Design a protein around this ligand. Structure first.
Ligand SMILES: CC(=O)N[C@H]1[C@H](O[C@@H]2[C@@H](O)[C@H](O)O[C@H](CO)[C@@H]2O)O[C@H](CO)[C@H](O)[C@@H]1O
Length: 583
């Protein structure tokens, strides 16, 4: 009995603390539904008893449907979930470290020590030319110490509908990227910033971003705009100078290469008007603008207050110059000046100034901002902000205030998202149930917004692979992907279960909206399934980290994710049946 094995949920983590409970498992069967061009995930949870085990390997057979059509084993990637330490933990250095299996790591062998849980992630890519049908296959588990092999009956049904490509949808996704963090971690030099040596470590993860739905691209326009909240500094992609004449000149060099990269990777297409450049921020931390004074040869700073005449003068110089620069590049139409949570005075000042400054064609900068909207009715001010993200904790569990607001914005063609961050449940922390990710995306469509935003693509601590612990926030909050190992030749990042569940959700809401468009007489019933979504309640654990109110609320998150997904594929079956019975 030297090695145990079973199928596990992807909805939650299999930890060491639940070893005893886990050792009693024996799910040998797995069945699920998917579309053509979709993906599915599963997990095989394994354990040892009082002996270590070596070269444990997982094998997938080809998958074959009822008509002999073949999805080869190359479309199934089985990857070890690597464990990493996490204080649990919000702003609390004494709370305990625990391993969490947050990292979708590598294929191939793995040694496991005595008395230890070890899980492998199974990702199944259904090719975009796959035939519909019910496919069948086997996943296998040997080791050295096993003179035998375990077997698992896997089947999935491919429905005769094609998963939309991100560009065929109207889902809006924005995850904030931190290219200088990538530079620090891979030891890229100042002089090699935003050259091909740097791009080699950005390109993989930014393609990952695009292929899941990524549309928004953040770019810093002043120095240290979030006051060094993150482990890494946030340098400005636009360097400010004050010349001998005492007016401000700007060096756009980094911004341009950053944006042009994203254009080259297909995330942004300024000519066709796709994607957003989010410029953070006209209201940076404490209004502090750092600059190199050429006159006094000193690094100096100023803190002009929004509305003040110095403030007006200064941002007028910046915005007028930035506009002209963007118009020369042909990027202006997709550029958004980002604001932040401030007083209505500060915000009214920002919007007044932005709407005043116009090009030769009487058009002004688009505006983006996270906000705190909750109570109904008044849209006179928000109708002036082009893209808004509302935090989860500032959304009412019951009222139609948000849905009406969002719908008003939808009627005018303005963007609206929701976001999660520290102190939210559901959220996308290391300690989260990954399913929370899928819920989150359903909630975005529950509220009739355009989708999801999060601040946390890649804000890595020192060595996230071994320890994710940071002095602020629930652990893993600042990053949805892990870096690869510093010496890596090949991979440049690792994905995570929580990210994979955000992807699932995005794929599934895209299904919903595809059905609504294509089968308009199934629409109202789809909307009813969506609008029947039930929101769980927020608790807090012993150390400041937001968690489910109770286990009833935990299981409700999982429950509802599955519920809406399955219901949505039943609508898919209805539209397919309807089609082939009318043919
Ligand atoms: C958009 C975003 O994620 N912003 C930061 C985020 O800030 C939010 C506030 O905007 C919101 O109103 O209140 C929250 C309370 O915890 C939170 O402060 O916080 C992130 C940290 O998880 C991060 O600092 C973002 O910069």
């Amino acid at each position: 009995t030297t090695l145990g094995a079973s199928i596990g949920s992807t909805d939650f983590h299999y930890l060491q603390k639940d070893y005893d409970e886990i050792k009693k498992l024996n799910l040998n069967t797995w069945n699920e539904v998917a579309w053509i061009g979709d993906e599915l995930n599963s997990k095989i949870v394994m354990w040892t008893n009082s002996s270590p085990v070596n070269n444990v390997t997982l094998s997938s057979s080809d998958f074959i449907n009822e008509n002999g059509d073949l999805i080869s084993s190359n479309n199934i990637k089985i990857s070890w979930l690597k464990e990493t330490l996490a204080n649990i933990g919000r702003s609390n250095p004494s709370a305990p470290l625990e391993p969490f299996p947050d990292i979708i790591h590598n294929s191939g062998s793995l040694n496991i020590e005595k008395n230890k849980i070890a899980s492998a992630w199974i990702n199944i890519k259904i090719p975009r030319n796959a035939k519909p049908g019910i496919y069948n296959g086997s996943i296998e588990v040997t080791a050295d110490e096993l003179e035998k092999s375990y077997t698992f009956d896997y089947s999935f049904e491919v429905l005769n509908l094609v998963q939309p490509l991100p560009s065929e949808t109207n889902t809006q996704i924005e995850f904030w990227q931190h290219p200088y963090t990538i530079a620090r971690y891979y030891k890229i030099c100042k002089e090699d910033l935003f050259t091909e040596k740097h791009f080699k470590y950005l390109r993989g993860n930014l393609k990952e971003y695009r292929n899941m739905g990524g549309r928004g691209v953040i770019a810093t326009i002043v120095h240290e705009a979030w006051n060094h909240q993150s482990y890494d500094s946030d340098p400005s992609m636009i360097k400010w100078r004050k010349n001998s004449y005492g007016t401000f000149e700007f060096d756009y060099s980094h911004f341009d290469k950053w944006i042009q990269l994203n254009i080259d990777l297909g995330i942004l297409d300024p000519e066709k008007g796709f994607g957003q450049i989010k410029c953070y921020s006209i209201v940076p931390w404490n209004n502090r603008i750092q600059y190199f004074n050429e006159a006094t040869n000193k690094e100096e700073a100023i803190n002009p207050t929004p509305g003040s005449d110095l403030w007006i003068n200064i941002w007028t110089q910046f915005l007028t110059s930035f506009m002209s620069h963007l118009e020369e590049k042909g990027w202006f139409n997709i550029t958004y000046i980002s604001m932040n949570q401030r007083s209505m005075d500060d915000l009214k000042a920002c919007v007044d100034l932005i709407e005043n400054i116009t090009n030769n064609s009487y058009e002004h900068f688009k505006i983006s901002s996270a906000m705190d909207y909750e109570s109904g009715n008044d849209y006179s001010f928000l109708d002036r902000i082009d893209d808004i993200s509302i935090g989860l904790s500032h959304i009412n569990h019951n009222s139609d205030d948000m849905k009406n607001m969002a719908t008003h914005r939808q009627e005018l063609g303005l963007l609206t998202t929701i976001y999660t961050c520290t102190g939210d449940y559901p959220s996308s922390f290391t300690i989260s149930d990954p399913s929370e990710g899928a819920f989150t995306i359903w909630y975005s469509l529950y509220q009739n917004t355009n989708g999801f935003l999060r601040w946390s693509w890649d804000g890595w601590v020192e060595n996230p692979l071994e320890n994710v612990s940071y002095k602020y926030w629930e652990p893993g909050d600042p990053f949805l992907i892990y870096p690869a190992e510093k010496d890596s030749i090949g991979k440049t990042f690792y994905s995570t279960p929580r990210l994979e569940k955000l992807k699932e959700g995005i794929r599934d809401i895209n299904k919903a909206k595809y059905l609504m468009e294509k089968a308009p007489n199934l629409k109202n019933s789809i909307e009813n399934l969506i609008y029947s979504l039930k929101r769980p309640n927020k608790g807090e654990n012993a150390y400041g980290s937001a968690v489910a109110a109770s286990k009833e609320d935990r299981d409700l998150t999982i429950s509802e994710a599955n519920r809406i997904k399955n219901g949505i594929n039943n609508f898919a079956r209805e539209f397919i049946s309807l089609t082939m019975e009318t043919l």
